[PDB]
Design a protein around this nucleic acid. Structure first.
Ligand SMILES: Nc1ncnc2c1ncn2[C@H]1C[C@H](O)[C@@H](COP(=O)(O)OP(=O)(O)OP(=O)(O)O)O1
Ligand SMILES: [Ca+2]
Ligand code: NA
Length: 430
DNA sequence: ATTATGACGCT
DNA sequence: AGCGTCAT
């Protein structure tokens, strides 16, 4: 009844760049603009592995994880840009620096949580309150929402995409109660107005287009963002949840894409998010644990409380390289040489981080995979990180893993290593 | 022979 | 601590 909280207290957005690494390459090389194109890493094995795909190229069926040689079979005119190689490994600096450009623009509008290299959550609750004051009961014009979709509309008693968008928006704005500063739907709408402004600023100042979701929490905002890509934003209201979730596969919701989501489906014998509403909170806790059960009970009702954390910078800085099949490292000299390459890249990034962000890492984590293990990581060990010096870091990393060498022979390494990873963690102000 | 990352949960 | 899950 009146005491039943509905998770409508906040306005949260998720802003995500469209085909991010591709846009970075298209900005730099105008010949790639408005073309089917993809970004690839390495080149020798099957033309390289695709890591980002333009929307033009997606229309041909090109996807992430595809080998470029195979992508070319679907899309013979596909254009490719290659990730830079330094010290024998892929170097993602150009994209990290592009990411910073976007995050700094978003930060002007509100506190953000960096969720990945190309996306951030935004807590707009206070910004919306402020804007509501300026508006002073004045209605919201569709002109302020030129790229916004209202999920679930139009509905009730044109055959073009943009036509439908506008009909939905009109129905939504027709129904709004602008006299109530505390209407959650009004708050979302003003939230969307602000996100239009944020997205315009990002595009003006960087050249990059993005999409966004606006809702009452991070999970719905993320889901919303994906509903209308590219270059559009989507408002998912609390009221839109029952119909949206009624046919929404469980795996689509963030954190349910893996084993947990599979177990929800298997154990409960359901397929869609909305079907979760028929279980009690205790029932869900019984199958999935106290924390997951409570989360599921609220989430299937559109309710989620995870805060937008005030964190714009990554918490760890890492460097990693695989050594698949016949390239696995089988000698001590090999292992030491590659640890050095990784350590040198890591030192470079750490030094820049210290200068830019007034902090120092204090722990070095070393991880390897051995040939045969289905797991991505086989062994992880930490040691102290007291100096930003690659030779020291590489020597220390070797020291902590050297006992893994099954080989009786000193110079040989067995089993061969198929992955090396160095990660700096535990930052302190400096 | 996806690869290169990065955040958070469990015990 | 070291491992596992999920994500981009
Ligand atoms: N599995 C991966 N391996 C390596 N790099 C990845 C992987 N997934 C994503 N990336 C990199 C390249 C992407 O351009 C960037 C952002 O990822 P993501 O947001 O999932 O897709 P995207 O921005 O390329 O397309 P979209 O428009 O669908 O969001 O991060
Ligand atoms: Ca993206
Ligand atoms: Na993303």
């Amino acid at each position: 009844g009146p005491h039943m909280a509905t998770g409508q207290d906040r306005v949260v957005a998720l802003v995500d760049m469209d085909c991010f690494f591709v846009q970075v390459e298209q900005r730099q090389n105008p010949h790639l603009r408005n073309k089917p194109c993809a970004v690839v890493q390495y080149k020798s094995w099957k033309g390289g592995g695709i890591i980002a795909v333009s929307y033009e190229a997606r229309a041909f069926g090109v996807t992430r994880s595809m080998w470029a040689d195979d992508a070319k079979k679907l899309c013979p005119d596909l254009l490719l840009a290659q990730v830079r190689e330094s010290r024998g490994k892929a170097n993602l600096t150009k994209y990290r620096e592009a990411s910073v450009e976007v995050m700094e623009i978003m930060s002007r509008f509100a506190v953000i949580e960096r969720a990945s290299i190309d996306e951030a959550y935004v807590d707009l609750t206070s910004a919306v309150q402020e804007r509501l004051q300026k508006l002073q009961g004045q209605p919201i014009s569709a002109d302020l929402l030129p790229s916004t979709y209202i999920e679930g509309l139009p509905q009730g008693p044109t055959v073009q995409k943009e036509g439908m968008r506008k009909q939905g928006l009109f129905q939504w704005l027709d129904s709004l109660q602008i006299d109530n500063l505390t209407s959650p739907d009004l708050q979302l709408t003003v939230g969307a107005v602000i996100v239009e402004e944020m997205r315009a600023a990002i595009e003006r100042e960087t050249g990059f287009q993005c999409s966004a979701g606006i809702s009452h929490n991070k999970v719905l905002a993320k889901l919303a963002c994906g509903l209308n890509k590219p270059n559009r934003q989507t408002l998912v209201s609390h009221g839109s949840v029952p119909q949206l979730f009624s046919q929404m596969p469980i795996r689509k919701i963030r954190s349910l894409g893996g084993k947990l989501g599979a177990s929800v489906i298997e154990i409960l014998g359901i397929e869609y998010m909305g079907e979760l509403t028929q279980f009690t909170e205790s029932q869900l806790q019984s199958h999935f644990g106290e924390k997951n059960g409570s989360w599921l009970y609220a989430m299937c009702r559109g309710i989620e409380h995870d805060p937008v954390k005030p964190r714009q910078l990554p918490k760890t800085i890492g460097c990693s390289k695989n050594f698949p099949g016949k390239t696995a490292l089988a000698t001590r000299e090999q292992v030491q040489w590659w640890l050095l390459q990784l350590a040198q890249e890591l030192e470079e990034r750490l030094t820049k981080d210290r200068n830019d962000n007034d902090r120092v890492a204090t722990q070095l984590v070393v991880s390897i995979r051995v040939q045969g293990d289905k797991r991505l990581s086989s062994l992880r060990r930490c040691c102290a990180l007291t100096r930003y010096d690659a030779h020291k870091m590489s020597h220390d990393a070797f020291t902590v893993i050297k006992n893994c060498n099954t080989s009786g022979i000193q110079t040989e390494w067995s089993p061969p290593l198929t992955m090396l990873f160095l990660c700096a963690t535990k930052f302190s102000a400096s």
